[PDB]
Each structure stands twice: as structure tokens, then as C-alpha cells.
Design a protein around this ligand. Sequence first.
Ligand SMILES: Cc1cc2c(cc1C)N(C[C@H](O)[C@H](O)[C@H](O)COP(=O)(O)OP(=O)(O)OC[C@H]1O[C@@H](n3cnc4c(N)ncnc43)[C@H](O)[C@@H]1O)c1[nH]c(=O)[nH]c(=O)c1N2
Ligand SMILES: Cc1cc2c(cc1C)N(C[C@H](O)[C@H](O)[C@H](O)COP(=O)(O)OP(=O)(O)OC[C@H]1O[C@@H](n3cnc4c(N)ncnc43)[C@H](O)[C@@H]1O)c1[nH]c(=O)[nH]c(=O)c1N2
Ligand SMILES: Cc1cc2c(cc1C)N(C[C@H](O)[C@H](O)[C@H](O)COP(=O)(O)OP(=O)(O)OC[C@H]1O[C@@H](n3cnc4c(N)ncnc43)[C@H](O)[C@@H]1O)c1[nH]c(=O)[nH]c(=O)c1N2
Ligand SMILES: Cc1cc2c(cc1C)N(C[C@H](O)[C@H](O)[C@H](O)COP(=O)(O)OP(=O)(O)OC[C@H]1O[C@@H](n3cnc4c(N)ncnc43)[C@H](O)[C@@H]1O)c1[nH]c(=O)[nH]c(=O)c1N2
Lengths: 386, 386, 386, 388
Amino acid sequence: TYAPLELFDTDRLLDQDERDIAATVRQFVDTRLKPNVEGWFESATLPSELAKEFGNLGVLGMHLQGYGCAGTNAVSYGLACMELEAGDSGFRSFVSVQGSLSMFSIYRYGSEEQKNEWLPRLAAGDAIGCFGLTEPDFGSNPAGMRTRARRDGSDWILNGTKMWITNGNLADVATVWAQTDDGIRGFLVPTDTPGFTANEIHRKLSLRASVTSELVLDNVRLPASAQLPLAEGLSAPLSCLNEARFGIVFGALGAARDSLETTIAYTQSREVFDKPLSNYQLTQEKLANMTVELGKGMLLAIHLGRIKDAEGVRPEQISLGKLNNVREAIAIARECRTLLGGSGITLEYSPLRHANNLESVLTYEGTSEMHLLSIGKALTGKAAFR
Amino acid sequence: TYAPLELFDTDRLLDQDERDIAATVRQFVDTRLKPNVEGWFESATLPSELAKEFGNLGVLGMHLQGYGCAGTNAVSYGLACMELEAGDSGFRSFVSVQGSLSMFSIYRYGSEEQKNEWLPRLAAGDAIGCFGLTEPDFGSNPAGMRTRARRDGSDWILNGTKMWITNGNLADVATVWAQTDDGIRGFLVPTDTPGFTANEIHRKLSLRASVTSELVLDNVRLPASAQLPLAEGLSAPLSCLNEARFGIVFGALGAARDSLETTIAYTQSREVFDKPLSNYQLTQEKLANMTVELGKGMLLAIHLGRIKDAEGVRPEQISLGKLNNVREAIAIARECRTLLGGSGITLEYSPLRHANNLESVLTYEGTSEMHLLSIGKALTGKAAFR
Amino acid sequence: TYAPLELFDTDRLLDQDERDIAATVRQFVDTRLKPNVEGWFESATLPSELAKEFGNLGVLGMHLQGYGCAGTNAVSYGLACMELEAGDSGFRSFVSVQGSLSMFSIYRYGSEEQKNEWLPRLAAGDAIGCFGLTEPDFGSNPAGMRTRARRDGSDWILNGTKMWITNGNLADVATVWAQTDDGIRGFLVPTDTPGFTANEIHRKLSLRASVTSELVLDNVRLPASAQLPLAEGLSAPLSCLNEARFGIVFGALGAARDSLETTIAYTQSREVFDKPLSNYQLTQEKLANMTVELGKGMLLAIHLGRIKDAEGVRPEQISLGKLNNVREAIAIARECRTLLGGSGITLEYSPLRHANNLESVLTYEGTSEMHLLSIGKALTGKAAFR
Amino acid sequence: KSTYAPLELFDTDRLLDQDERDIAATVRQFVDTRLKPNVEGWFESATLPSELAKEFGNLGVLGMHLQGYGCAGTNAVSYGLACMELEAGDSGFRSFVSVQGSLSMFSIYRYGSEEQKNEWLPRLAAGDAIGCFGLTEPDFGSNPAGMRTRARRDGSDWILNGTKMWITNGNLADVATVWAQTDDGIRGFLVPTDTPGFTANEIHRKLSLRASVTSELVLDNVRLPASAQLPLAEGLSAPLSCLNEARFGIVFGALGAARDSLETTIAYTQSREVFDKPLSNYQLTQEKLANMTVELGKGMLLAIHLGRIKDAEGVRPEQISLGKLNNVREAIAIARECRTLLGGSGITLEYSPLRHANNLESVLTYEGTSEMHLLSIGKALTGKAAFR
Ligand SMILES: Cc1cc2c(cc1C)N(C[C@H](O)[C@H](O)[C@H](O)COP(=O)(O)OP(=O)(O)OC[C@H]1O[C@@H](n3cnc4c(N)ncnc43)[C@H](O)[C@@H]1O)c1[nH]c(=O)[nH]c(=O)c1N2
Ligand SMILES: Cc1cc2c(cc1C)N(C[C@H](O)[C@H](O)[C@H](O)COP(=O)(O)OP(=O)(O)OC[C@H]1O[C@@H](n3cnc4c(N)ncnc43)[C@H](O)[C@@H]1O)c1[nH]c(=O)[nH]c(=O)c1N2
Ligand SMILES: Cc1cc2c(cc1C)N(C[C@H](O)[C@H](O)[C@H](O)COP(=O)(O)OP(=O)(O)OC[C@H]1O[C@@H](n3cnc4c(N)ncnc43)[C@H](O)[C@@H]1O)c1[nH]c(=O)[nH]c(=O)c1N2
Ligand SMILES: Cc1cc2c(cc1C)N(C[C@H](O)[C@H](O)[C@H](O)COP(=O)(O)OP(=O)(O)OC[C@H]1O[C@@H](n3cnc4c(N)ncnc43)[C@H](O)[C@@H]1O)c1[nH]c(=O)[nH]c(=O)c1N2
């Protein structure tokens, strides 16, 4: 017999170092995270202590060069994301935010002082970052954001609210995007600055094993040096999103794979009408169709990773993978749950948890519809968002 | 503008008393249950005190005659289930179990003594019933059940485990189905009988606002009089399931309607890219497609109810409704959630809760695949379960 | 065993006169049309003499009163359309055009003299009508039409081109819609009028057993009396479309039923791997899913017909049926073909022919997307066509 | 750059070398200049002229992945790209080539004697002779193990009796590879089509693959010498090995029909105005275009992946099933969806989508139905066969 991706033979597309990274992260997930995940999800906690475990593993800022970062290629970051999310999307979300959003914002747009202050600590998981773009009234359309930075002498004064901010209540530093007299700018906000409050969001059905927050900035005063000096316009936060989105292209496949392998095993173990469930045509149809989507998504992820490591990948190319792999992953998790029957309604087997988590992954970092329309613009030359 | 079912004009198919029942139950849901459902779901409880509230409302055993039961037609019972499930599937599940499973088992197969002892209290919600058919190893195939009742003189001794039993930990009496030397039989088990233990199931992601239990029967000794005297073979429990399934055909539509109406209101209020979300083609596509399925399902529910009242409805006819209305309802809830964006991931707006709940509804009272194959058998004359 | 609609028991929703009409038309189709349809499709012909057979049967203008028309209710007209299309969509298309487009245009908007000139012959099939609305450049948006009718004294002169006009080359009289200085108006154009040319369309893959034409109007001069006196604005042609669309709501279900019943019979007779094809789960899944859509569509059609016969049916209500029933019918025809294997690629068994014909039905009388957006506007109050 | 073609957006050309891209371009230009001007008439009239055999032979596509005998000796990825371009023309063009190379020639190349190879392969490669492959019977298609055509020994000679059905090129062929049951199991025979007792009857009134010859073969007391047996073919494995070669071509070919449909339709949406703007400007249109592009590109990545495995250690049947199941069913969905965007104009032979969709009905069914490939994948994942 073959595992779903073994049937496709996606491993032939990876070198030994890449395969070793995947195996290493998978082992970490199996030993350190999997035994605790059901309780973390039920209780709606993801302990701050995991930051150091992820730091020590090497995954925080792993695609970045220097500052104690691993300095891997893009494919390797993707595989790590895939393995984290196979554990739980909350694990991958923590890492997406730390590396591709927080650390990348500083790496790409920061001063030397900012890079030297924060990057080693963030790489080690000794500090935690967050990325405040979305607001209650603006998610898909961040160009409309209302958070505002005004100058007071050489200082800045920030006022606004950000919403749905992963790690907001855990962070030491927030990368906050705000309108200014000269256009959108980014600021590093120490989270102990007076006027800065993070309020944790509870009663989530998705991403319970994750910290998600409202950030309220009430006359937050910062020095001139707090601005990320190179970030100008919406292109700056969007560049960070394109790094994180790349990780999600791989990550969603991990949730899908974990669901599907767990469910194939269940079908072998469960007898219905005196035969294993895996013996019936209806079961095999589902397993085959799900396998076909998972393998196509893995081929697409690796393809995009190879482009990224060569000349770079364009946003509309990332959109192929973000649109496809998240929507096909949530379909796989949901279909798997049907094969588990009653046993599938609890936290015992991963599919329903994965499906719930993937609701957030479908929406964040650009909704399916935003990516759909980005592809449509690339094919036609006509923007149809408005 | 039209509400989805208003566009179909399904009200024209209903008489005044039926429409009044729907309105009465909807007002009860809105006032007594909706203010509390978010907390009930989060904390995984459905208070036992609701038994008396449902009893006083008149919905427990409402389609039965006598014993303080309402004696309504089948369409009215359907509409009540639709309105209860629009609140939450846990509300409708409580009522399905109390009336169509527990009370119906006693009404149809019980002695006069059993009916007089239990039916008035169950109708009033002064006692709670449960129905123990499913076992850890046998759900879709109850013919294979291994709970056993053996004779000891004129007494019976029951041994087995039932699983996924709604209201198990709240019930005063359990209808327990068991194999015997002469075939499947049913027994009324007072829940304080020595050897009978109910263990509540926790860490559910679906039907959290509902009590679901394991029942362990360890040499439970009963008198001859505890047997349901008229129940012989699998036909007896299945007749109860067909009563309950009928209610679910309507119930699932309630969860779908509540999701859809909530979501339409959200799309009218939420502005994206300077216009209400409801203005966009992609939004209207979703709203129209969902409306089309909801109305078709409503026509099918009413059609089946009219058949049931006029002449009885066959199991394979119920299967049309149970297969269709549950799977289309869960699709509607899921698609609604996408339109809500990030706000849809919490308990604030009903779609994600309804989607999760409908995972159980899809599986219980015969999975989609069971109803699919029952329809296949009716069309071809060939059973394809084995 | 049950036929698909027998399992639903849609016959219970009809009276005996209605059921008798369905049976009469089915017998006519089976005896007079079916033995010839494969040759007609292959040769791309539909003999003009069939007009008289349809006329004698009573289906031409059957829902109209007087003028030798049958004067049936709307449900009966729907059932006749269903049975005609079960034969072939080209048969139903002939009847849709003759009755609901041509004759209804004259009946509803025509003068006393026009009605007496044409309605009795059109009802008998001794004359043939057509309906010229669509232009090469304007189909979904007939408000944009450019055929123009101008005055010259009391005469009218029409100039423009109509396209995809069913029966154009066969018609004695054409109802032609044109823009004027005062808005859209309608005209009865005898097809021997100087300047009026019909050119037949060939190399169709859909609706080969049907005549479809280009109409070229080169300054066609008519008397004042040729105007349909009561037709003003786009509402007039659309009212005719709404009559024809209603018949299509039923008609598409006939193509679906014919495909499905033919395919069920094939699966019972075809042995694969030593058992009838109907015995396999994959087969039964398809048969069951297709049955579910066919029956839901039938319930919707009958519901719309009862509304139509009472206070009248609104366009957006018709859109529910036209959107749903055509797109579900083409899916049934296509899925059926897969079950036939190689034998399904020829004209021997109806599915592939039906699927091809339904391509036209999906597009004409308002595309799926037009009906979709019509429903969206009803739900939201916002038009999203532009 | 303001716009990208669907596969340009994926950048699948970066996965191909110059020689491979040159082959695609060469076959595309042949299809555009020689075949496309005639395809509408050929489909309507239900003809595919036999002269095309020599034209395909001269082009180099007949037996292109085979070595020797005047064959091109290309890699498998190049054969795939040629099939993609032929099918973008019409599936009947690709079907001709599938049968000639991967079924007829390959049967002889793999299982034949030296004498058979020398007699037939050079002519077949050149398109100076035409071959066909008779596996399917009226009663047995998805289950060829159940075939009833029989070969019985008469001394040193053979006598064959049976009927084959749905045989591409049957009425044009000079030689038929005919699969038959024997006392010792399934065997293969080269049957010259002028052998007394061998008759080919052409199938008419097709709605799919009208620009292709499809036949019934009837064998009544067909006598053959011992030398007519393919000596190395034993059991169902032999015909299935031929199918696995042809199926690989189809994994690519179906994408050609999809691409041709989709690019034709994107161009139409750019030029067609509805409600005062190009049809391409609307969200509903862009939704369709994007979803179809996503499937086309995923399919192309899968095809190239399978080709690279084939040119390395080799592709297993269940891996080919991934491609055949996926790419054909997604291609037919693309062609159908494209047709909706064309409106009325899409119902004729003018624009390719409806013709492609009809042709793909055959492609979905032949060389193993979607359900056969689905269940082969299921068996690979579970270790349980669910055919019976
Ligand atoms: C758990 C979790 C965690 C995070 C985040 C979300 C969640 C749920 N996000 C926020 C996330 O990026 C945000 O939810 C998405 O951008 C979507 O925006 P809204 O939720 O406002 O939906 P919004 O209101 O924009 O969209 C609602 C619906 O409208 C549709 N739509 C929008 N525009 C349309 C158009 N023009 N045409 C048609 N349809 C259109 C959308 O596709 C969607 O279906 C975030 N943010 C952040 O800054 N930092 C973070 O760390 C995180 N993390
Ligand atoms: C919250 C909740 C509440 C309740 C219940 C469940 C849940 C989740 N049920 C139990 C319920 O009826 C049961 O879950 C279903 O019958 C399905 O059985 P299993 O969960 O054992 O799945 P099972 O293991 O039977 O099926 C697993 C999967 O295999 C598929 N399958 C099964 N047979 C097949 C075949 N022959 N061919 C192909 N596929 C096949 C199924 O469709 C499903 O997808 C119950 N029970 C009870 O007695 N009293 C109660 O009050 C309740 N309430
Ligand atoms: C065989 C046959 C027979 C007939 C007819 C057609 C055919 C094929 N019709 C013509 C028919 O009514 C016409 O084809 C449809 O109205 C669709 O118009 P177009 O073909 O111009 O497509 P058009 O160019 O309008 O539309 C093309 C595509 O764009 C989509 N689209 C259009 N507007 C859009 C928007 N605002 N947003 C998003 N998408 C949009 C459509 O849904 C479609 O998918 C006819 N006519 C007649 O007058 N008399 C007759 O007898 C017949 N009979
Ligand atoms: C135009 C064209 C051209 C060719 C061919 C076909 C056509 C249409 N073929 C024949 C082709 O290979 C054949 O049609 C397929 O193998 C399918 O077999 P049947 O048509 O007998 O369907 P069959 O009767 O086997 O199958 C009918 C349906 O049942 C399903 N089914 C079968 N077994 C099942 C099971 N166990 N469980 C569930 N479902 C099952 C199938 O998937 C299908 O949906 C051929 N042949 C050849 O030898 N040489 C050639 O050149 C060609 N060329």
C-alpha cells in the first residue's frame, strides 16, 4: 500500500536536506505537540512557552539569513509549515506570524538598530512578535484602514484599533500599520507602551489553540526611531503577507494529509457489515478523490517554492496556491469526518478540528474570493474587485 | 425584498394553525433559548430544566394522541422541529429523542402499564427518556448489535454497551435494544437500576449544547414486565427512527434558514470596497444558490409531511428528505460562514455552530450513505449495503 | 422497484385530468416521434409536417382560451412540455415557440383582426410562427437591441437582424421586436414581405432536430396595422418569455427523466464483473443522487404551476425553476452517459443527445447567470447585472 | 505584462527544455495550419481522411517514443506534449496517434518476433500502413479478463472466432492486434485485415469522436499461421501494458482540449460586450476563468510529473491512473463550462468547446473508465480490491 503522497511520489522532487527538515519537524510535532493538542484546543490555549520550543527547533524566521536564523530555502520553510499544520493550524499560525510577518517586516523594512534589537530574540523565541494590519471595518480592503499616526515634534502619536491579531496578547513587539499624512507607514510598537492594550478574543470555534486579539491604541506615543524606515504604502504590508501566504500554500496540505492518513487508518480498523470500511466502493471513491487533490496541491506548492527560490514568485502565482490548497484542504478534512461517523465529532481524530481551523485559513491572508479575483485580473487585465 | 422561503412562497402550502405553531415555537426559541445558546455551546451543556419548558410549550410527543400529548398532525411536528433547530440542533435533538424515540417506543410497543406510567410524565417534561440502539462497534448496522438479554427464570439480565446516546446521563428511563435467543427485543430500563451506568461524552466539537452518553449495562437484572411486549426484530427500533428522521427532514432546514437569513442581513450591513457586500455578483451567486436549495428542501419536507398525514410515509421516501435536507443544510451553513469572514469564526453568528452541529445530524439516524443506498435499493431492487 | 418520480409520488399532486394529459402526450411521443428522432438529429431536420401532428394533438397554444386552443391550466401545459422534451428538446422548443412566444404575443398584445387571422391556423399547426427578439450583438441584454422601426406616413419600416430564431425559416409570421422613437414595440411580419429574409443555421451540435435561423430585415415596409397594438416596452417580450420559461421549467425535467429511466434500465441489463451494473455502490450513488434532483425539480415545477394558475407567478419565482431545473437536468443527462460507457456515445440511448440539447436550454430564455442574478436582486434589493 | 495565458500564469514552460518546447510548437503549428481549417467539416461529416496517416508519419509522431524502425526516439515528455497539441486540435487526431503508436506499434515492438517488427514497424512509423488494437468486445470493456474471442489450435495453425467493438481505425487498418482467450490464457495475434473471415464494420451516428474511424470487428473462422501469434504476450498483462502507454499520452492529450477550449473562451470574453462592458470584466466570468485555469495548471503539473517519472525509473499503473482520472474529468468540466460563457454562439462548430466536450465523453470512458481508475487508486491506498 501507498500513503497518498507516496502514490504521487512527491518526495522525488525534494533533496535529502529538505526531506530531513520535514522529518525533523514531523517528529517534533508528534512528540512535543500532538500529545497536548486536544486539551489545548478544548481549553482554548496555546502556551507562550512553545515560543522557545519553536525557537530551539529552528523554525522561527527559518527562511531569513542571519541573526541566528536557519537560512533555509523557501521549499524547506514550506515543508516545515506543512508539518506544523499537520499538528494544528495554530502551530503554523504562530510561526507564520513570528517569521514571515513580524521578523520579515523588520528584516526587510527596518533600520539596523531595529534588526539588531529584535531579530536574534525573535529567532530564538525569547521575544514574540505580532502584525497589526486588519481592523474591525477593513480586512479584505486594508487600503481603507483608519488607524492613524500623527507627528508631535519628532514623536509619533498612534490612534486606532486592529482586530483578529494573532499573538497580540503574547507579543513583546507589534508591527502596526497606520495611515499618515504621506501614506501608509509601519511602526514597531513595544506592547508595554502606555495607551497600547491587547484584549484576547474568546469563544472561537476555529483556531482555539492560538492567541487572537484586539489591539487598541489610545494616544500611543513613539519616538521617530519606531517607524520602519523603508516601508511606504500598502506594498509593504502586502509583501509580508506574500511571505506568509507562501507558507500557508504548504501548511494547508499538512492539515489535509493528517486528516486523510488518520482517516485511511480508521477505515482499515473499522468493520461495517462484516467487512473493513476500506473495502467498500463508496469509501474508496472518497479516499481516491481526496488523494488526487492532496497530490495536485503538493505538486503546486513545490512548483511555487522552486520559482520562489529562483527569481521570486509573483503575488498572483501565490494566489493559485492559496486559493487552491486551502479550499481543497478544508474539503478533504470535512469529507474525512464523514467516514469516521460518530467518532469523528470529538477531538479524538483530527479531521473536525482541522476543518474548523481551516475556516480561519480560508479567510485570512486574503480570502478565497480575493485570490480568485487576483487570478482573474492576471488572466484578463481587468480588476473586478470594485 | 424577499426572505428565501418567501420567494418560494412555501407559506401558501401551510394552514393557519401550522403557521401559528411555527411562529409560536420561533418566538419561544428567540426569547428563551437564543440569549443562552452561545454560552451553552461553549460550556457544553444543555440544562435539564429545559425539559419542563419544552413540555409546557407542548412539543414533547406532540404528534402522539392521548397521555397529555398535543395530538398535532405531522406537518406541525415538522415545523416545530424546524424552529427548534433554527435555534440549535441540540434543542431539536432533545425533542426528537423525547418524543419520536423514547415516547414512541413506549406508545407503539409498550404495555398499558408502561404507557400509563411514563407517557404523561414524558409529555410534560417531568421525566426524560433516552433510546439506546447504537453500540461502539455497530451504528449503521444495528442488525449486528451484541448487547444481549438472557432469561433467568421470568427475569432478564442485560449485558452490553450503548454509545452516542442522547440524554443518557439525564434520563429517568432508557429504551434499550438487545439481541435475544429469539431475535431483537426492547426493554425499559430505569436508569438507577444496579449495573446501569451512563458516562457523559466530552470534547465534542458538534452538538455541544446536548447531552450524549455511553451506557454500560453490566448484568442489569429486570423483571419480565420491563420488556416492551410488542417489539420484535429490528423493525421495532427502525419504526422509531423513521418517526425521528421525519422530524430531522424539517429540522435541518431550520439550521439552514437561520444561517442564511443571518448571513443575508450581514451582507446588507457589511461594506467592502465602498459598497454593501450584498451588491457583488459573487455574493449574490452564493445567496441565490443557497436559497434554491433551502426552498427545494422545504417543498420536499412539506411533501413528505402531507404524505405521512394522509397515508403514512415509507422509509425510502423519508430517506429522500433525510439525505437531501441534511447535506444541503450543512453546505448552506458552511458557505454562509465564508461570507462572514473573520467574524464568522466565533459563536457571534450562527453559521459555524450550525455547520458543526449538522456534522452529527448528517451521521445519526442513518448516515447519508445509508439513505443513499436505501434509495438505490428502491430504484433497482438490489441491496448494495453488503 | 420504483421509477424515480414514483418514489417521490409526485402523481399525488396532480388530478386525473392532468395525469391523463401527461399519458396522452407520452404515448404520442413514443409512437410518432421516438422511432424517428435519431435520424432527425443526425440529419439535422425536424419535418415541418410535425406542426400539424402537434396541432391535432392539441398542444399548440394549449394554455390559451378560444381560437381552437385547448384552454388547459398551466400545470397541464407544463406536463405536456415535460413529455415533449422527454422525446427531444427540439419537439418542446417547437411547441414553446408556437404557443408561448408566437401565439401568446398575438393573443396578449395583438388586435382582434390579428388574432382571428393567425390564432386558429397556429393552433391547428396549419401556420407556423416565430419570435425575433435576440440579435447577434444582444441576447442577455435585449434592452440594448438595435433593430429599428420608423414611420413613413402611416407605414412602419423595420431594419435590423435577429439571430438564433427558432422556426425562422419555417414561419409564416414573425413577431419582431424593435426599438422606436417612443420605445420598444412589436410587429407581426409576414415572412414573404419584401426585405425579409430567413437564413438557416447549420453545424449545430445542440438542437439539431430543430430549425434555427438568422432573420435579416432590410427596410421591411409594413402597414400601421402590422403593429401589435398593446405592446409597449421591454415588458411585452419579457411577458412572452415568462410564459415559455414556465414550460421549460417542466420540459427540462422530461429530458432528465428520459435519460435517467433509460439509464436505470441499462444498468439492470448490463453485466460487469459477473453482476448487473445496478448492483454496485458507485452505480447506486449516481442513480440516487440523480433521482433526488429530478424529484426536487418536479416538486418545484408543480408548485410554480399551482401559483401560476392561482394569482400568477412572478418572474423571479419562474427564475428559481428555470435556473434549477435546466442546470440539474443537464447534470443528470451527462452523469447518465457515464453509466452507459461506450454505447452512450451514439444516438442509440438518449442521454448524450439530451445533454447536448440542454446546452441550448441552459442559455436561451435567460441564461443561468441571468436567472441567478434575478434571484439575487429579489433577495437583496440590489441589481448586480451591471 | 498586463495578461497571462492560463499556463503562462503557472509558468509550466520553465519545467520543459528547449527541445521539448520546440516539439510542442512544431506540432501546434501543424495542427493550426493543416488540421484546424478542416476540422469543422470533418466532424460534421463524420470523417477523418486516411491520408492523414502519412502526414502524421512525416511529422514524426507515429511511434515517436519508440527506438529504431524509423521512429523518432523522443523521450516520454515529448510524446506527451505532441499528444497535447494534437488533442487541442481534436481528440480524433490524438486518438489516431494513440492507436497507431502506443497500442498497435507498441504491441509488436514489445511482444512481437523480429519478423513481425521488420514487416510492420517501419511502415507503421511512416504512416504507410495503419494498425488497430482489438481488445474490447460488445459484452466486455471495463472487464477484459472476461473476453470471449477465442483462438484454438489446429495443428501448428490457429483459428480465431469472436467480435471486437469500439475499435479505432478498424476499417482503415492493414493489421489488427487481436486479443483472444486460449486454453492456456489470453494471447495476442497479428491479423492482416484481408484475411478471409475478418470483417470491419464502421460505427456511425456517434455524437463523440465523429472525426475518427471506430469499428466493429467480426472474426468468423479466421485461420492464421503459428507465426501470427505475438510470441511474448501472455495474459492480460500484455494488452494492459499497451493501454498503460496510451493512457500516458491521454494524460497530456486531455489538457490540450482543455487549453484550446479555455484560451478560445478567454478571447471571446474579451471581445464580447454585455451590458456595455466586455464579458471578461464581470465577477461571474472571472470566477469561471480562474477556477478553470487552476485545474488546467494543476493537470499540467501532474502530466509533467508523470512524464519525468516515466523517463526515469518508470511510472506504475496506479500513478498513471492519477493522471487519467484527473486530467480527463477536469478537461471535460473545463470544456463544458467554457461553452456556457459563449452563449448561443457556443452551440455550433464555430468555437471548439462543445466539440471538445463531446469528444472527451469517449476519452473519459476509454482506456479505463473514470471509475476503473478511481478504484485502482483505491486499491493502491488500501490494499483491498473493490471492483467486485
Ligand atoms: C483567527 C484569525 C487570525 C488572523 C486573522 C483572522 C482570523 C479569523 N486576520 C484577519 C484576516 O486577514 C481577515 O479576517 C481577512 O482579511 C478577511 O477580512 P474580514 O474578516 O474583514 O472580511 P471582509 O469583511 O473583508 O469580507 C467578507 C466577505 O466578503 C467577501 N468580499 C470582500 N470583498 C469582496 C469583493 N470586492 N467582491 C466580492 N466579495 C468580496 C470576502 O471574500 C468574504 O467572503 C489577521 N489580520 C491581521 O492583520 N493579523 C493577523 O495576525 C491576523 N490573524
Ligand atoms: C451526537 C450524536 C448523537 C446520537 C448519535 C450519534 C451522534 C454523533 N447516535 C449514533 C448514530 O446513529 C451513529 O453515529 C450512526 O448510526 C452512524 O454509526 P457509526 O458512528 O457507528 O458509523 P459507522 O462506523 O457505522 O459508519 C462509518 C462510515 O462508514 C459508512 N458506511 C457504513 N456502512 C457502509 C457500507 N455498507 N457501505 C459504505 N459505507 C458504509 C458510513 O456512512 C460512515 O460514513 C445515536 N444512537 C442511538 O442509538 N441513540 C441516540 O440517541 C443517538 N444520538
Ligand atoms: C438553439 C437556440 C434557439 C434560440 C435561442 C438560442 C439558441 C442557442 N435564442 C437566443 C437566446 O435567447 C440567447 O442565446 C440567450 O439570450 C443568450 O444570449 P447570447 O447568446 O447573446 O449570450 P450573451 O452574449 O448575452 O451571454 C454570454 C455569456 O455571458 C453571460 N453574461 C451576460 N451578461 C452578464 C452579466 N451582466 N454578468 C455576468 N455574466 C453575464 C451569460 O450568462 C453567458 O454565459 C432565441 N432568441 C429569440 O429571440 N428567439 C428564439 O426563438 C430563440 N431560440
Ligand atoms: C470512440 C471509442 C473508441 C474506443 C473505445 C471506445 C470508444 C467509445 N474503446 C472501448 C473502451 O475501452 C470501452 O468503451 C471502455 O473500456 C469501457 O467499456 P464499456 O463501454 O464496455 O463499458 P462497461 O459496460 O464496462 O461500463 C459501463 C459503466 O459501468 C461502470 N463499471 C464497470 N465496472 C464497474 C464496477 N466493477 N463497479 C462500478 N462501476 C463499474 C463503468 O465505469 C461505466 O461507467 C476501444 N477499445 C479497444 O479495444 N480498442 C479501441 O481502439 C478502442 N477505442
